[PDB]
């Protein structure tokens, strides 16, 4: 019942198990499986409408990209610049660079580097070819500069299916598609995003651990003005139960995605994403949409995510009103001690 | 230097000390004196402009009322209804009756009773004449229904002086004049008001203990939606240092006012008001003015009182946004734990 990602699937044509238990990292909390369903299955429509995650196995969303790999993409993607994140651990914490102004004691552990696709490939290879232990993770928004064969792939994505989704759920516009290409073992630690995400897996296998927005009190996000806004403060490999006691009560939903699977990551749901150990490189492309417009009159009882939005806005307005984000904390405490705690 | 109210003053004509040390209650914190100055003294103007308290000894503000007493007021004040607060302790905690909706576990210890001036006097007297231990405190806004001799007194207040003050400080309009008539030993426990107050003493002696708005963290006001909004949770006679640890650090300003003295109580300053033990009944009339309009662009550094206003507004908006004031607390805590504390 806490079966996490379940018994690994069998590759077609008796090519054996897709992955095994030992490619997954070990964590302190339990999880139950995300459902894997066909896009024709009305349970899947039901899950998406209710803003619960579902892995869809047959959308054909990025069918033309399943041939993508490093060689094919070097050949075809253009001479635009790609953002490449760097790290000396498997954990790639990310920084909002605009917020770094306001936190001096904030030297960064994952630096961005702009480079050309060929350079990233070279750099990956002189690491492999020399056995160094650094890690890279290309994360770049698909845009104008990409070459023609890639623009044809893109155009062959299943827009008929995803636009009907966008229409049915009343979401806003497609804000972007992020192209992600990681090394085996890379982790994107637990965070939430404020848009709806269809997360289309292309090459390799990723274990995705999701927590509902109602787990906010177990995951201890950073302050909103901090550069790690929206990321959990808890180190999942070494959790500090003294600072984060409710992380002892956290319960997640997990799954392992491979080529052709699309994971719906609903807005505000926490997600922790790991490229399987010793599984080769991973490729994914996501689809971010603004969420449906927020309705005319509030309907009680509020959803968890709207309480999350409320907290964010309190922190943001208070930061503006005090003229300094560093004063948010002291004031919030003055507000609650001996009054609300 | 912590001399509190100082060596008691001598009544003119060798009528002896106005009051003595033993008419004052004993409390845990230190205090320093509020200055007593003449309204001609430019230090007093300076204090008022800077929103610091000053006792003015010679304004003649309510000179025609110094003849007021129970007999004169029964004779002359009309047949309007007077609010009379009741209590079985010296401590008169007050309730905002509109806020009682939202706190069920809120039976009240000081009930209001409407009555005619003659009834209040009778009621005082059958207590005196029978030696019961209940306490009353008439607190009523001066208005239309008062009789002609009282309206003449009123008209003879020193409007020339107080309107020039109102003009010079850019305050808004006179919102009201509260008439207060207390029994000896009555206490109004520590609270703040959001208007500027000239507090004109008429009969008897009151010890006024003020704390600056920056003592908010030592005085632990009730939640804003509570019926005791703006009052301190701390019982000054039996202070709970485990719930209110910073009450151990509180420092106040004190003074003893008598007939003819006017105490400026600046907006947001905490005040605790006690009618001296065994000093007879007290009479006071206050003058409440809306504070100056809040300036176009905020000027950093903010004043303490503006941080207080900011806290109030957070509590109020959050109560509206959640649809229930009882959820304010839980959410504020969820917001700060493991994030800002
Ligand atoms: O794929 C990853 O490692 C990170 N992806 C996301 O967090 C996302 O798509 O929102
Ligand atoms: O005089 C009292 O006992 C109470 N007065 C006040 O709190 C006031 O004038 O604001
Ligand atoms: Fe994300
Ligand atoms: Fe008051």
DSSP state string for B182-234:
E-TT-EEEEE--SSEEEEEEEES-EEEEEE-GGGHHHH-BPPTTSTTTTBBSS
User: Is A214:A253 a contact under the CB 8 Å cutoff?
Assistant: no
Is A340 in contact with B323 (Cβ distance < 8 A)?
A: no
Which among B223, B324, B341 has CB closest to A340? B223
Q: What is the CATH number of the domain that holds A340?
A: 1.10.287.1010
A100 plus A147 within the same structural domain: yes
Ligand 2: atom nearest CA of B273 is: 3
Give yes or no for a contact between B160 and B64, defined as CB atoms under 8 angstroms apart.
no
Asked whether residue A289 falls in the same domain as residue A303, the answer is no
Closest CA to B33 of B58, B17, B48, B54: B54
Q: Which residue out of A273, A279, A285, A288 has the highest number of ligand 1 atoms within 8 Å of its CB and is therefore the one to mutate?
A: A273
- Mutation site, B338, B340, B341, interface A, largest A CB count within 10 A: B338
Give the structural domain span for B332: 298-341
Residue B22 class from Cβ within 10 Å (0-12 exposed, 13-18 middle, 19+ buried)?
A: exposed
| Nearest ligand to residue A205 Cα | 1
Residue of A243, A324, A336 lying closest to B333 (CB–CB):
A336
Inform me whether the C-beta atom of residue B309 falls under 8 Å from chain A C-beta atoms. Answer: no
B142 and B66 housed in the same domain: yes
The token duo for B332 is 């504020």
Structure solved using which method?
X-ray
**DSSP secondary structure letters along B310-339:** HHHHHHHHHHHHHT-GGGHHHHHHHHHTTT
Interface A-B, measured as beta-carbon pairs within 8 A, has a size of 93
CA–CA separation, B341 and B337 (whole Å): 6
Query: DSSP 3-state assignment of B166?
Result: helix
Residues 6+ apart with CB under 8 A from A286: A177, A178, A180, A197, A198, A199, A200
- Which of B173, B171, B174, B195 shows the shortest CA–CA distance to B293? B171
**Pair A190, A237: CB distance under 8 Å:** no
SS (H, E, C) chain A: CCCCCCCCCEEHHHCEECCCHHHCCCCCCCEEECCEECCCCHHHHHHHHCCCCEEECCCCCCHHHHHCCHHHHHHHCCCCEEEEEEECCCECCCCCHHHHHHCCCCCCCCCEEEEEHHHHHHHHHHHHCCCCCCEEEEEEECCCCCCHHHHHHHHCCCHHHHHHHHHHCCCCCEEECEEEEECCCCEEEEECCCCEEEEEEEECCEEEEEECHHHHHHHCECCCCCCCCCEECCCCCCCCCCCCHHHHHCCEEEEEECCCCEEEECCCCEEEEEECCCCCCEEEEEEEECCCCCCCCCCCCCCHHHHHHHHHHHHHHHHHHHCCHHHHHHHHHHHHCCCCC
Q: Least CB-CB distance to B332: which of A221, A338, A340?
A: A340
Residue A194 sits in the same domain as residue A206: yes
Q: Which stretch of DSSP H or E encloses residue B174? A: strand B174-176
How far apart are alpha carbons A161 and A39 in whole angstroms? Answer: 9
The closest-lying atom of ligand 2 relative to the alpha carbon of residue B206 is 1
Please, what sign has the CA dihedral across residues A37, A38, A39, A44? Answer: negative
Residue A175 known to bind ligand: yes
Please note each residue after which chain A is broken, C-to-N distance over 2.5 A, or write none: none
Residues in A 210-249 with any Cβ partner in B closer than 8 A: 216-217, 220-223, 233, 243-246
Both tokens of A115, joined, read: 């480079």
Pocket test for ligand 2, best of B25, B175, B188 (most atoms within 8 A of CB): B188
Q: Return the residue matching tokens 């992380």.
A: A247
> How many other CB atoms sit within 10 Å of the CB of residue B250?
23
By the CB < 8 Å criterion, does B341 face chain A?
yes
Q: How far apart are CA B28 and CA B249, in angstroms?
A: 10
Closest CA to B308 of B225, B236, B224, B252: B224
Q: Tell which atom from ligand 2 comes closest to the C-alpha of B92.
A: 3
The answer, for B2 touching chain A at a CB cutoff of 8 Å, is no
User: d(Cα B90, Cα A103) in Å, to the nearest integer?
Assistant: 51
Asked whether A127 and A134 are in contact (CB, 8 A), the reply is yes
C-alpha span between B174 and B290 (Å, rounded): 7
A300 in B contact zone (CB under 8 Å): yes
Check residue B303 and report its DSSP letter. P
Q: Are residues A133 and A268 in the same domain?
A: yes
B333–A331: do the CB atoms touch at under 8 Å?
Answer: no
Q: What's the CA gap between A288 and A139, in Å, rounded?
A: 14
Subunit contact A221:B339, Cβ cutoff 8 A: yes
Whether B203 and B325 share a structural domain: no
Same domain, B286 and B303: no
What is the rounded radius of gyration, in angstroms, for the C-alpha atoms of chain A?
21
Residue A224 has, within 13 A of its CA and on its CB side, a CA count of: 21
A238 shares its domain with A313: no
Note whether B290 and B311 are same-domain residues: no
> A332 and A214: one domain?
no
CA separation for the pair A38, A54 (Å, rounded): 10
Which of A223, A319, A325, A336 is best to mutate for the B interface (most B CBs within 10 A)?
A: A336
Please, which residues have CB within 8 angstroms of residue B260's CB and are 6 or more apart in sequence?
Answer: B57, B58, B60, B63, B66, B201
Q: Phi and psi of A26, rounded to 5°?
A: -110, 130
For ligand 2, is residue B262 a contact (CB within 6 Å)? no
Ligand at minimal distance from the CA of A85 is 1
Any ligand 2 atom below 6 A from CB of B180: yes
Closest CA to A19 of A261, A250, A269, A251: A261
Write out the H or E segment, with its range, that includes residue B240. none
Compute, in degrees rounded to 10, the torsion defined by CA atoms A8, A247, B311, B53.
Answer: -160
Strand B54-56 vs strand B36-37: parallel, antiparallel, or unpaired? parallel
DSSP for residue B9: P
Q: Do residues B212 and B86 both lie within one domain?
A: yes
Contact assignment for B322 to A307 by CB distance below 8 Å: yes
Q: Cα B49 vs. chain centroid, distance in angstroms?
A: 20
Q: Which residue has a Cα nearest atom 9 of ligand 1?
A: A286
- Do residues B190 and B271 lie in contact, with contact meaning Cβ atoms separated by under 8 Å? yes
Is A272 annotated to bind a ligand? Reply is no
Q: Check whether the bond before A174 is cis (ω within 30° of 0).
A: no
Give the burial string for B181-191 (b: 16+ CB within 10 Å, else e): bbbbbbbbbbb
- A66 touches B: beta carbon within 8 Å: no
Q: Is B165 in the pocket of ligand 2 (CB under 6 A)?
A: no
CA distance B305 to A17: 67
Copy the structure tokens of residue A340.
């609300």
Instruction: Judge if the beta carbon of residue B194 lies within 6 A of ligand 2.
Output: no
Q: What are phi and psi of A210, to 5 degrees?
A: -115, 145
Q: Which is nearest to A198 in space by CA: A272, A286, A285?
A: A286
A335 touches chain B (CB under 8 A): yes
A188 CA: nearest ligand 1 atom: 3
Handedness of CA B84, B89, B90, B94 (dihedral sign): negative
A116: nearest Cα among A79, A146, A74, A143: A79
CATH number at residue A278: 2.60.120.10
List, in sequence order, every residue forming a beta bridge with A146; answer none if it has no partner. none
3-class DSSP state for residue B262? strand
Question: Is the CB of A231 inside a 6 Å radius of any atom of ligand 1?
Answer: no
Question: A221 with A312, same domain?
Answer: no
Cβ distance B336 to A333 less than 8 Å, yes or no, reads: yes
Contact (Cβ atoms closer than 8 angstroms) between residue A176 and residue A123: no
B144 contacts B258 by C-beta, under 8 angstroms: no
- Number of domains present in the structure of chain A: 2
* Helix residue spans in chain B (DSSP H): 42-49, 70-76, 117-128, 148-155, 159-168, 216-219, 304-322, 328-336
Of A218, A220, A207, which is closest to residue A263 (Cα–Cα)? A207
Give chain B's length: 341
């Amino acid at each position: 019942v806490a079966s996490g990602s379940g018994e690994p699937r069998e590759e077609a044509g008796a090519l054996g198990p897709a992955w095994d238990e030992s490619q997954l990292r070990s964590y302190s909390f339990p999880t139950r499986p995300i459902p894997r369903l066909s896009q024709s299955d009305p349970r899947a429509e039901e899950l998406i409408e209710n803003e619960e995650p579902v892995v869809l196995t047959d959308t054909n969303l990025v069918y033309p990209a399943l041939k993508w790999d490093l060689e094919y993409l070097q050949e075809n993607i253009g001479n635009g610049d790609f953002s490449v994140y760097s790290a000396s651990t498997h954990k790639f914490l990310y920084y909002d660079e605009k917020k770094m102004a306001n936190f001096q004691n904030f030297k960064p552990r994952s630096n961005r580097e702009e480079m050309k696709f060929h350079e990233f490939v070279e750099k990956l290879q002189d690491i492999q070819q020399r056995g160094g232990e650094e890690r890279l993770y290309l994360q770049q928004t698909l845009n104008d500069t990409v070459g023609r064969k890639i623009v044809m792939d893109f155009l062959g994505f299943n827009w008929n299916w995803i636009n009907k989704q966008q229409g049915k759920r009343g979401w806003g516009q497609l804000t972007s598609n992020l192209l992600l290409i990681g090394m085996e073992g890379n982790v994107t630690p637990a965070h939430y995003d404020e848009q709806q995400n269809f997360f289309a897996q292309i090459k390799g296998y990723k274990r995705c651990i999701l927590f509902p927005p109602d787990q906010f009190e177990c995951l201890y996000p950073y302050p909103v003005h901090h550069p790690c806004d929206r990321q959990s403060q808890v180190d999942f490999d070494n959790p500090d139960y003294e600072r984060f006691p409710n992380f002892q009560n956290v319960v997640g939903y997990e799954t392992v995605v491979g080529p052709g699977d699309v994971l719906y990551i609903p807005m505000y749901w926490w997600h922790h994403i790991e490229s399987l150990l010793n599984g080769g490189i991973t490729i994914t492309v996501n689809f971010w949409y603004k969420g449906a417009p927020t309705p005319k009159r509030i309907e009680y009882p509020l959803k968890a995510h709207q309480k999350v939005a409320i907290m964010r806005n309190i922190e943001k307005m208070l930061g503006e009103a005090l003229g300094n984000p560093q004063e948010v904390g002291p004031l919030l405490n003055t507000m609650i001690k001996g009054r609300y705690n």
